């Protein structure tokens, strides 16, 4: 369903240069997980029925950063400003999605296809559209399915983005990494979910919801058994998420 816009050769050149600069920066700063949260959590404000929100750079706005769900994303935005200034031609919308793609790549994940041309939109979406970590499978379908327009497969694969990073008690209130290797992108999120609650590792209620749902559980089993299958489905879902409301 996608018809990507034309961008100039100069725009394309800047995308390529920014991609490389983002690799070095994100690797050095150890901030891949925060950058993936910035890209992916921000994309998840899309509502398909109204064609509002989505990955259009509004998360830059202090007003959107101030939403309690976005606690800590101001750090991500601040970290990227100096680099972004080296690429004035790029939209913030494209820049943040590129950062998310690079975050997955530099931690060892799949190469998620990237298409430029997102425009920076003036008005943040209303607060309250983001997935709620305390809720379950019905809520996940409401947000990812009814609002975003993503599939059940996409939900489980994208939940695997928690294979990098950690929660912080001062941000969400939850605390700790999902895996023993929070800077490595692999299928351990699913392996850990299956094995039970190991000491020192985190499972949100929203992660646990995947285990008890008839459609989600087979996918969790698949990804725990087959990292290649996870990487394929993950790359597909991340691309879709990064493109919500964009190019159709």
| Residues near Na ion (CB under 5 A) | 163, 179, 181, 184, 186, 188
Q: How far is the CB of 188 from Na ion (least distance, A)?
A: 4
Residues 188/163, Cβ–Cβ less than 8 Å: yes
Complex with ligand HEM: residue 118 or 171, whichever CB lies closer: 171
Structure token digits, residue 142: 């409401």
Complex with ligand HEM: residue 61 or 141, whichever CB lies closer: 141
215 lies in the binding site for ligand HEM (CB under 6 A):
no
Catalytic site includes residue 41: yes
CA distance linking residue 46 with residue 53, whole number of Å = 4
240 lies in the binding site for ligand HEM (CB under 6 A):
no
54 lies in the binding site for ligand HEM (CB under 6 A):
no
Complex with ligand HEM: residue 7 or 181, whichever CB lies closer: 181
- Closest residue to bound Na ion by CB: 179
Complex with ligand HEM: residue 14 or 94, whichever CB lies closer: 94
Q: How far is the CB of 118 from ligand HEM (least distance, A)?
A: 17
Nearest to 199 by CA among 220, 172, 174, 180: 180
Structure token digits, residue 66: 């101030």
Structure token digits, residue 192: 């850990």
CA distance linking residue 120 with residue 55, whole number of Å = 9
* Residue 25, C-beta contacts closer than 8 angstroms, at least 6 positions apart: 83
Q: How far is the CB of 109 from ligand HEM (least distance, A)?
A: 10
From 165, 240, 242, 246, residue interacting with ligand HEM (rule: CB under 6 A):
165
CB atoms within 10 A of CB 103: 29
SS3 176: strand
168 lies in the binding site for ligand HEM (CB under 6 A):
yes
CA distance linking residue 203 with residue 150, whole number of Å = 23
Which of ligand HEM, Na ion, none does residue 58 bind to, with CB < 5 to 8 Å depending on kind? none
Q: How far is the CB of 129 from ligand HEM (least distance, A)?
A: 12
Structure token digits, residue 198: 């190991």
Residues 191/157, Cβ–Cβ less than 8 Å: no
Residues 190/234, Cβ–Cβ less than 8 Å: no
CA end-to-end distance (rounded Å), the chain: 6
The pattern of x and - marking residues 23 through 42 that bind ligand HEM according to CB under 6 A reads ----------xx-xx--xx-
Which of Na ion, ligand HEM, none does residue 168 bind to, with CB < 5 to 8 Å depending on kind? ligand HEM
Q: Which residues bind ligand HEM (CB under 6 A)?
A: 33-34, 36-37, 40-41, 72, 131, 133, 158-159, 161-162, 164-168, 171-172, 174, 204, 206
Among all residues, which ones are annotated catalytic? 41
């Amino acid at each position: 369903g996608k018809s990507y816009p034309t961008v100039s050769a100069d725009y394309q050149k800047a995308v390529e240069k920014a991609k490389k600069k983002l690799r070095g920066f994100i690797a050095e700063k150890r901030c891949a997980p925060l950058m993936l949260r910035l890209a992916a959590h921000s994309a998840g404000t899309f509502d398909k029925g109204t064609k509002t929100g989505g990955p259009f750079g509004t998360i830059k706005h202090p007003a959107e950063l101030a939403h309690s769900a976005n606690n800590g994303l101001d750090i991500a935005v601040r970290l990227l400003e100096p680099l972004k200034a080296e690429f004035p031609i790029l939209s913030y919308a494209d820049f943040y999605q590129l950062a998310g793609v690079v975050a997955v790549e530099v931690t060892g994940g799949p190469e998620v296809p990237f298409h430029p041309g997102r425009e920076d939109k003036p008005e943040p979406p209303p607060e309250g559209r983001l997935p709620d970590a305390t809720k379950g499978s019905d809520h996940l379908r409401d947000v990812f399915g009814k609002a975003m327009g993503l599939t059940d497969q996409d939900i489980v694969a994208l939940s695997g983005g928690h294979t990098i990073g950690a929660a912080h008690k001062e941000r969400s209130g939850f605390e700790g990494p999902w895996t023993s290797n929070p800077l490595i992108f692999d299928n351990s999120y699913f392996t850990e979910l299956l094995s039970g609650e190991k000491e020192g590792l985190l499972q949100l209620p929203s992660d646990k919801a995947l285990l008890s749902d008839p459609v989600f559980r087979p996918l969790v089993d698949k990804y725990a058994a087959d990292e290649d299958a996870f990487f394929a489905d993950y790359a597909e879902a991340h691309q879709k998420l990064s493109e919500l409301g964009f190019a159709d």
